Amino acid sequence: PQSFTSIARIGDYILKSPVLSKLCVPVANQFINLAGYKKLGLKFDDLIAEENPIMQTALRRLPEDESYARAYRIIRAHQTELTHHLLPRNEWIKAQEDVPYLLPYILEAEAAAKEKDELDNIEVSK
Amino acid sequence: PQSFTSIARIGDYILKSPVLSKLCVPVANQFINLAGYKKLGLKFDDLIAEENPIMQTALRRLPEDESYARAYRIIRAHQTELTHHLLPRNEWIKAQEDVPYLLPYILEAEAAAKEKDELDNIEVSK
Amino acid sequence: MAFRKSNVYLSLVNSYIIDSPQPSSINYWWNMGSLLGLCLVIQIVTGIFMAMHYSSNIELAFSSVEHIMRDVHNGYILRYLHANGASFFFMVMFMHMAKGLYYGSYRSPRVTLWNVGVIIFILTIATAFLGYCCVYGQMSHWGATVITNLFSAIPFVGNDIVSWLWGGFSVSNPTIQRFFALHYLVPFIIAAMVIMHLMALHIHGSSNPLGITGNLDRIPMHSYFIFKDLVTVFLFMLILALFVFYSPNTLGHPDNYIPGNPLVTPASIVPEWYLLPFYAILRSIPDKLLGVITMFAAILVLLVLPFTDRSVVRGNTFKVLSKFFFFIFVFNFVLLGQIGACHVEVPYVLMGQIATFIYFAYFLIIVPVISTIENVLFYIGRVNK
Amino acid sequence: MAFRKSNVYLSLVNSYIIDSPQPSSINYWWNMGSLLGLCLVIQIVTGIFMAMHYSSNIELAFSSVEHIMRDVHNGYILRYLHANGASFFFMVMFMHMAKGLYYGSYRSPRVTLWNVGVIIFILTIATAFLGYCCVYGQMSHWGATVITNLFSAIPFVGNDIVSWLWGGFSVSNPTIQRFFALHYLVPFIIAAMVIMHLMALHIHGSSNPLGITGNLDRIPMHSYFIFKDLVTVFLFMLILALFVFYSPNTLGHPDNYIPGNPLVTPASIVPEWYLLPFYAILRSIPDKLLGVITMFAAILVLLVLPFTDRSVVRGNTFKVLSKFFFFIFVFNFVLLGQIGACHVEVPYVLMGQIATFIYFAYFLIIVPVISTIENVLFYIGRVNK
Amino acid sequence: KSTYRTPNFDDVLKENNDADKGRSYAYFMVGAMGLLSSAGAKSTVETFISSMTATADVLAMA
Amino acid sequence: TGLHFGRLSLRSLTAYAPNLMLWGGASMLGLFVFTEGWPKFQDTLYKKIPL
Amino acid sequence: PEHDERKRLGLKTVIILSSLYLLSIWVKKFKWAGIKTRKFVFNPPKPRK
Amino acid sequence: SLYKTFFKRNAVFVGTIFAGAFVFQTVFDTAITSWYENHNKGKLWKDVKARIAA
Ligand SMILES: CCCCCCCCCCC(=O)OC[C@H](COP(=O)(O)OC[C@H](O)COP(=O)(O)OC[C@@H](COC(=O)CC)OC(=O)CCC)OC(=O)CCCCCCCC
Ligand SMILES: CCCCCCCCCCC(=O)OC[C@H](COP(=O)(O)OC[C@H](O)COP(=O)(O)OC[C@@H](COC(=O)CC)OC(=O)CCC)OC(=O)CCCCCCCC
Ligand SMILES: CCCCCCCCCCCCCCCCCC(=O)OC[C@H](COP(=O)(O)OCCN)OC(=O)CCCCCCCCCCCCC
Ligand SMILES: CCCCCCCCCCCCCCCCCC(=O)OC[C@H](COP(=O)(O)OCCN)OC(=O)CCCCCCCCCCCCC
Ligand code: HEM
Ligand code: HEM
Ligand code: HEM
Ligand code: HEM
Numbered sequence A, B: 001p002q003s004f005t006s007i008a009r010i011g012d013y014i015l016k017s018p019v020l021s022k023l024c025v026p027v028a029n030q031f032i033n034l035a036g037y038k039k040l041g042l043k044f045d046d047l048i049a050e051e052n053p054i055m056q057t058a059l060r061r062l063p064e065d066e067s068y069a070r071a072y073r074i075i076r077a078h079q080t081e082l083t084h085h086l087l088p089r090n091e092w093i094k095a096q097e098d099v100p101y102l103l104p105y106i107l108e109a110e111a112a113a114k115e116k117d118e119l120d121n122i123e124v125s126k
Numbered sequence C, D: 001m002a003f004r005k006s007n008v009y010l011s012l013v014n015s016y017i018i019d020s021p022q023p024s025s026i027n028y029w030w031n032m033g034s035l036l037g038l039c040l041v042i043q044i045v046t047g048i049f050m051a052m053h054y055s056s057n058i059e060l061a062f063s064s065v066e067h068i069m070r071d072v073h074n075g076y077i078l079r080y081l082h083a084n085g086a087s088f089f090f091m092v093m094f095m096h097m098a099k100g101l102y103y104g105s106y107r108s109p110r111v112t113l114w115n116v117g118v119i120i121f122i123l124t125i126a127t128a129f130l131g132y133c134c135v136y137g138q139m140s141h142w143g144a145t146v147i148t149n150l151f152s153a154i155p156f157v158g159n160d161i162v163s164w165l166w167g168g169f170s171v172s173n174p175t176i177q178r179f180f181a182l183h184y185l186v187p188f189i190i191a192a193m194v195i196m197h198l199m200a201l202h203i204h205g206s207s208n209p210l211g212i213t214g215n216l217d218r219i220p221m222h223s224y225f226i227f228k229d230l231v232t233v234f235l236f237m238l239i240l241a242l243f244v245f246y247s248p249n250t251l252g253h254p255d256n257y258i259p260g261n262p263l264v265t266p267a268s269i270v271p272e273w274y275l276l277p278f279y280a281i282l283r284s285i286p287d288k289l290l291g292v293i294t295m296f297a298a299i300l301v302l303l304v305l306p307f308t309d310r311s312v313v314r315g316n317t318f319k320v321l322s323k324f325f326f327f328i329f330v331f332n333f334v335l336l337g338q339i340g341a342c343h344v345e346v347p348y349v350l351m352g353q354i355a356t357f358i359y360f361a362y363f364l365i366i367v368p369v370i371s372t373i374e375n376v377l378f379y380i381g382r383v384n385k
Numbered sequence E: 001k002s003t004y005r006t007p008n009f010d011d012v013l014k015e016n017n018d019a020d021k022g023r024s025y026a027y028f029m030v031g032a033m034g035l036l037s038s039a040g041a042k043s044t045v046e047t048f049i050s051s052m053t054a055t056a057d058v059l060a061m062a
Numbered sequence F: 001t002g003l004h005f006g007r008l009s010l011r012s013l014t015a016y017a018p019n020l021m022l023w024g025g026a027s028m029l030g031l032f033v034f035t036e037g038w039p040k041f042q043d044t045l046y047k048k049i050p051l
Numbered sequence G: 001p002e003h004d005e006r007k008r009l010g011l012k013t014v015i016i017l018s019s020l021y022l023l024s025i026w027v028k029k030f031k032w033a034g035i036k037t038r039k040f041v042f043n044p045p046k047p048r049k
Numbered sequence H: 001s002l003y004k005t006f007f008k009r010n011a012v013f014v015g016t017i018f019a020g021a022f023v024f025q026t027v028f029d030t031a032i033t034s035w036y037e038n039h040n041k042g043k044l045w046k047d048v049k050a051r052i053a054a
């Protein structure tokens, strides 16, 4: 519902401020560790809801070696959930592996859909 | 429901008898003229119900120049029926044109299905 | 695509009454099925509004209907449209089934469609029987006494099915209260069977009056058969309005305006006109157990027609012998209705026994013999041998 | 192919409860939907058998229910299973809707499925209101007096909607007779909405407790979720049997065993427990017209949730702030039910006004603000800038 | 590693498989469930059906 | 040398000869259990020596 | 007046429904054991295809 | 073997669960009624009528 262009605009404003990045960034690190998706072997970009045309475009353009690895992490998380267990601690996702791999493909598809919408409902002047 | 092999067995027995072909054959000529399918431009083999596997086999094996002419006679008979009229008298089917064009294809498919059924439910003896 | 094809609820509407391919040559006999859908809505809607004022106790049932006729605003319109609308429902249903017999609509691949229709006909008969009991007139009490006493002749279970149906020792107060509750329910079971009836029709489509394939020339339903349906809807409503406002008691019995008395027997016990042929079949068997079996066999014998028709042609359009014996069967059905309204007297007793035999011999003897002969006459009139 | 896939009526059965692909990780919260189908069958079947012995006149209605409890064979089993079964129907429905809020089942592409469910919830509330009137106890008469008098505050049409709903000048004999006839009908409209509810579910399937796609690992319904459904069916029947046979009047009010008297007001007018939170919302607005609008807005505000949830993640499993405020909303709903059973006294009047504000502020203020903040915390906790 | 190597299943496997004992105990529990479900469904229908017989006030005027 | 005809078989019924003794007997056991407590079915079923 | 009969019929119903509840837990856990002990292994495929 | 004599032949696996449930009804109802009346002895009407005979 909220676009990723809007999320990146608010988030990059905080990260450039030296006083706002001392307050919010320690709170965001505690929020992610309490969420617990890394103990099931998932990255955050695996959790994005995909039933919309922007996300279907970005998933088509992903390189195929990363698409095979994403499918294994989702399947392993479903099997761990039905057994009501967690993964062994040496199989958890580390923080330096929790990178936004899908975010540049999403932002490129959002900018192209915005430019098409502006050209389709447009004014002229002599 | 009654097979064409059974109809041809009864009908060829009457036509070989010289006393039975003097009684039934004048009655059959009055029966066909009172039926009235020739005044709509149809032959009798156009009237056979086709929603069964034997008739679908025989319609596939018909030569294509006869299949195009059969489709035109059926379409012309539907248009004449909805106008509540008859065809002009010079467009009626004549008796020497009302030939059984589809009957040899039907009898060949019926004999092959009977031989398959006898070999599938069969006895042996030493 | 368009929104009428992509939406989940509108695509069911679009594939049934908008874009469905119809054969181009069907006539006005193919309009009876949509009139039956209008009749069922009329019977349900007038039924709910009358039920807001009705009492089902045996001391209060007759006066509740008189309270509807006198004190409810437009209450006489609700009752007369309901009672006359039941007779119009049976007349359209008789013509709808006779269209299927004539054109061979029962044949393959439409056997499941014909079998579901026979279940609908049984449930409609049971519905009209239960609503007639709720008046508790003099014909209501004694008609329920005659029919419920038939089931005591069943061996070993008969005397306990009847008292389980009465809730007591005769037709009394628990009988009328349970008959009104069953009368509310069965029209909702009929509406579910109509949905199963329309699903089987969507698979194969309709037949046509020539009997041959319709896949070569189709026209869509919307604005051609929608406007052809409007002609018969307005003619149906006009004739129904002439009965409701100008002659509202012609299709009924004047003994039903006397309250039910279990000590006085009427001089003649007569059903409504649409149940009169089945009443004459029952009175033609002297043994009581064989009479109730033959009465229920007159409906179940409709299921043997896909197996006793031996013709290789679908329908009666080009068959002169099948045309003649179809109309013999139609006027035999009218004669059986007239015998069912007479007294048990000479010579109506023997006439009803011969007409009962002709009814069952049509399905089991006449149709397989005549259709075998017509197969052979088509062959030897063409083949040169 | 097999006959369960080629037949026209069995392929609907096969694609729904036999071969339908389910996500492998759904838990026991996904069993509440099939328990609601069993509850609707139980309420319909016990309803027909009691209606064979019931009289809806205002002089006879209370004694008819006492006649069922004393004279009908196993009649006390039919009533107690019916009255306690209505409370079990509302408890399973509350847990079914709260599962949808927690896991984000309302979101796209399941908005049509959520909207049809809100219509079902409205029709179930109206059904239970009409059946409570048919007892004509002392709580039945005065509860109908309070609710029907709310509609006279509507401008220009209000004083004529109420007397059209009464059929007269107060709650009287035409009111009870029309309320029993409406009570028979609305469960059949509910059954048709359940069929439309299952059609929309077949298009997209179910969600799963992780919130992500289930297309990668599916197992069929038959012998896995059929036998998982049997565990909760037998536990449901065991707890229902403990209430019907061992404590049958715990979930009711003892004033409903006094016959209805329009001249004596009870000391306290209290609804059943499952309508108590909506009763406390109505009593917290002093103006009479704005109170009945706010009472109906408490159900219709469920439709704004697909538009006020701003998160890019479906469900509450990985969100600690949305978990906290979900359980704030749950215990606020329990407190509103407790306020609705108290007298209008200090300090329960102010407590009900604050709890009414918290109910509406969850859907319109708390959910869009918290889900926007959780979008940003996920971003800046990962992106190096 | 090699797909011909099967992972460790030893904490769930029986010490002796003995196919005529494992089948026999599972079919005892499924058979006991169909036994009790049929006796429960039979008494349920007879409770509803017997409510249509004559009431206690009707039998008192016999 | 050949067997029976018409979408069934006497071979299909010479193996299914003595088991509609027990598939008919499956629903001989049907109205066994489903008919109990009736006043109808007790002059042939309650006369037995136990219980 | 039904008080003595209601408590006798309730004892038969609770005993039967308790046995069906305990048997359904055993049968569900037997029929789910193949899914619950399933194992997965990932080997990354070779590129250029 | 006792699988194939009790649960294989499913012409009577439907049958034995339909016939063992018939004799189950009378033995179960006799056992509970005897336990229920012995737990409440001295309070029933038959225990009262035996010494209001006077
Ligand atoms: C309870 C009663 C409820 C009444 C509600 C209405 C129910 C009507 C029941 C009668 C019925 O079923 O009629 C069916 C029957 C059709 O059978 P059929 O194949 O012989 O005739 C094709 C079609 O009529 C041609 O009718 P035609 O098509 O020629 O009419 C011209 C026009 C339509 O005109 C009308 O609107 C007049 C009604 O259509 C056009 O062609 C012009 C378009 C550019 O109609 C006939 O014409 C046959 C006459 C026999 C009717 C005797 C009924 C015995 C019971
Ligand atoms: C009201 C009348 C209706 C009666 C029936 C309705 C039942 C409603 C219960 C709420 C619900 O459906 O969710 C249950 C949820 C557990 O879901 P889960 O899949 O994660 O747990 C699978 C388990 O690990 C394996 O469970 P397993 O399948 O291995 O064994 C079954 C277990 C009983 O299971 C059930 O009865 C489920 C209700 O048998 C045993 O306990 C063995 C010893 C006898 O529980 C929770 O998430 C939190 C627990 C408290 C919930 C109570 C809240 C009620 C308001
Ligand atoms: C449980 C068992 C139930 C049994 C159900 C039987 C119900 C019988 C009750 C009466 C039903 C009315 C029968 C109507 C006949 C319908 C047959 C039909 O659909 O059409 C047949 C025929 C077609 O004629 P064509 O248009 O094809 O002619 C073109 C030239 N070949 O069209 C015609 O020729 C129409 C001729 C007019 C028919 C007159 C029939 C008179 C009926 C008297 C009714 C009396 C009621 C009091
Ligand atoms: C207009 C209509 C409004 C409807 C509002 C409905 C309010 C009625 C109250 C219904 C209570 C239902 C609350 C639970 C709803 C189920 C959904 C849920 O909360 O998920 C279960 C939750 C999650 O547990 P997990 O973290 O293990 O699973 C995560 C997925 N992998 O696991 C849990 O935490 C379960 C804990 C449940 C405790 C809830 C106590 C409720 C007490 C209510 C008592 C009411 C009678 C007095
Ligand atoms: C297919 C649907 C129906 C049919 C064929 C049908 C038929 C009948 C008939 C023949 C009568 C006797 C009428 C008379 O001669 O006076 C009757 C009476 C009655 N029916 Fe129906 N009925 C149907 C649906 C319903 C429904 C759905 C309801 C209620 C919700 C209902 C309520 C009543 C009532 C209250 C009476 C008694 C009043 C009267 O005599 O008109 N009916 N019905
Ligand atoms: C409430 C009752 C019924 C309703 C609403 C209904 C509705 C319909 C409709 C709309 C059609 C398609 C249009 C038409 O051919 O007229 C149809 C066709 C058909 N119906 Fe009915 N019907 C009902 C009862 C019956 C009964 C009682 C029978 C037979 C015993 C029956 C048998 C058939 C058959 C065989 C067809 C196919 C006709 C053909 O394709 O030529 N129906 N029905
Ligand atoms: C979703 C379905 C239903 C619900 C939620 C429901 C609910 C209720 C409730 C709450 C009562 C008051 C019970 C009490 O406290 O004594 C009641 C009474 C009654 N209902 Fe229903 N009902 C449903 C379906 C039906 C149906 C379909 C019928 C009839 C065919 C019916 C017939 C009756 C009767 C006769 C009473 C009065 C007897 C009594 O008090 O138990 N009910 N209903
Ligand atoms: C008589 C009433 C109802 C019946 C029989 C019913 C039935 C069902 C069934 C069988 C399912 C699929 C299995 C499951 O997820 O539990 C389902 C899913 C669902 N229902 Fe209902 N339901 C009813 C009422 C409602 C109500 C009142 C709501 C919401 C206001 C609702 C909303 C939903 C939603 C959102 C789902 C999808 C859940 C998911 O996929 O995770 N339903 N329903």
Ligand SMILES: COc1c(O)c(C)c(C/C=C(/C)CC/C=C(\C)CC/C=C(/C)CC/C=C(/C)CC/C=C(\C)CCC=C(C)C)c(O)c1OC
Pocket (backbone or CB within 6 Å): C015, C016, C017, C020, C033, C034, C035, C036, C037, C038, C040, C041, C044, C045, C048, C049, C191, C192, C194, C198, C201, C202, C205, C206
């Ligand atoms: C051959 O091709 C055809 C075809 O030619 C035609 C015409 C039709 C259409 C013909 C029909 C007869 C379909 C329409 C079906 C019906 C009208 C049956 C009615 C269905 C019901 C479920 C009846 C219930 C309806 C009601 C209105 C009951 C509810 C009553 C209420 C709400 C009033 C009570 C309210 C108050 C306040 C008292 C086809 O479907 C079709 O197949 C593709």
Ligand SMILES: COc1c(O)c(C)c(C/C=C(\C)CC/C=C(\C)CC/C=C(\C)CC/C=C(\C)CC/C=C(\C)CCC=C(C)C)c(O)c1OC
Pocket (backbone or CB within 6 Å): D015, D016, D017, D020, D033, D034, D035, D037, D038, D040, D041, D044, D045, D048, D191, D194, D195, D198, D201, D202, D205, D206
């Ligand atoms: C996601 O995958 C799923 C899924 O998870 C589930 C759970 C289901 C579960 C399905 C259900 C729970 C079915 C829903 C339940 C209903 C639709 C019930 C409808 C209610 C009725 C039809 C009531 C009808 C009752 C009667 C007619 C009884 C009438 C009483 C009579 C006749 C008394 C007898 C009279 C005399 C005189 C003896 C799915 O279909 C499904 O696939 C989509």
Ligand SMILES: CCCCCCCCCCCCCCCCCC(=O)O[C@H](COC(=O)CCCCCC)COP(=O)(O)OCCN
Pocket (backbone or CB within 6 Å): C006, C007, C008, C009, C010, C012, C013, C195, D111, D112, D115, D116, D195, D196, D203
């Ligand atoms: C099996 C027999 C029973 C089936 C009956 C079928 C006929 C049902 C009535 C048809 C009337 C059409 C209703 C309006 C259709 C528009 C619905 C819609 O716009 O879909 C939704 C709006 O959601 C709703 O609020 C639905 C309310 C349903 C109200 C019905 C009482 C949006 O449309 P959507 O984009 O989802 O379309 C794609 C669907 N796959």
Ligand SMILES: CCCCCCCCCCCCCCCCCC(=O)O[C@H](COC(=O)CCCCCC)COP(=O)(O)OCCN
Pocket (backbone or CB within 6 Å): C111, C112, C115, C116, C191, C192, C193, C195, C196, D006, D007, D008, D009, D010, D012, D013, D195
């Ligand atoms: C209003 C809501 C409607 C919801 C519809 C849900 C579907 C409910 C059906 C439930 C299962 C019913 C089992 C049907 C048995 C198989 C059908 C069959 O035997 O059809 C036919 C025989 O015809 C009949 O006698 C129909 C029996 C009427 C059934 C009325 C209940 C089987 O023969 P056929 O080869 O044609 O089957 C293929 C069809 N495509």
Ligand SMILES: CO/C=C(/C(=O)OC)c1ccccc1Oc1cc(Oc2ccccc2C#N)ncn1
Pocket (backbone or CB within 6 Å): C125, C128, C129, C130, C132, C133, C139, C140, C141, C142, C143, C144, C146, C147, C269, C270, C271, C272, C275, C276, C278, C279, C295, C296, C299
């Ligand atoms: C309650 O009385 C109902 C009557 C009625 O016509 O209802 C519409 C009726 C009146 C007088 C005499 C008999 C009456 O009922 C009936 C009932 C009836 O039912 C059947 C119809 C076809 C097949 C079997 C039956 C039966 N049983 N067949 C004939 N008359």
Ligand SMILES: CO/C=C(/C(=O)OC)c1ccccc1Oc1cc(Oc2ccccc2C#N)ncn1
Pocket (backbone or CB within 6 Å): D125, D128, D129, D130, D132, D133, D139, D140, D141, D142, D143, D144, D146, D147, D269, D270, D271, D272, D275, D276, D278, D279, D295, D296, D299
């Ligand atoms: C006939 O009295 C019915 C009552 C009942 O509880 O029925 C189950 C009742 C008894 C006493 C007082 C009020 C009663 O009814 C009601 C009715 C009610 O209805 C609504 C519920 C939600 C939203 C709007 C309304 C309304 N109107 N909300 C609360 N109590």
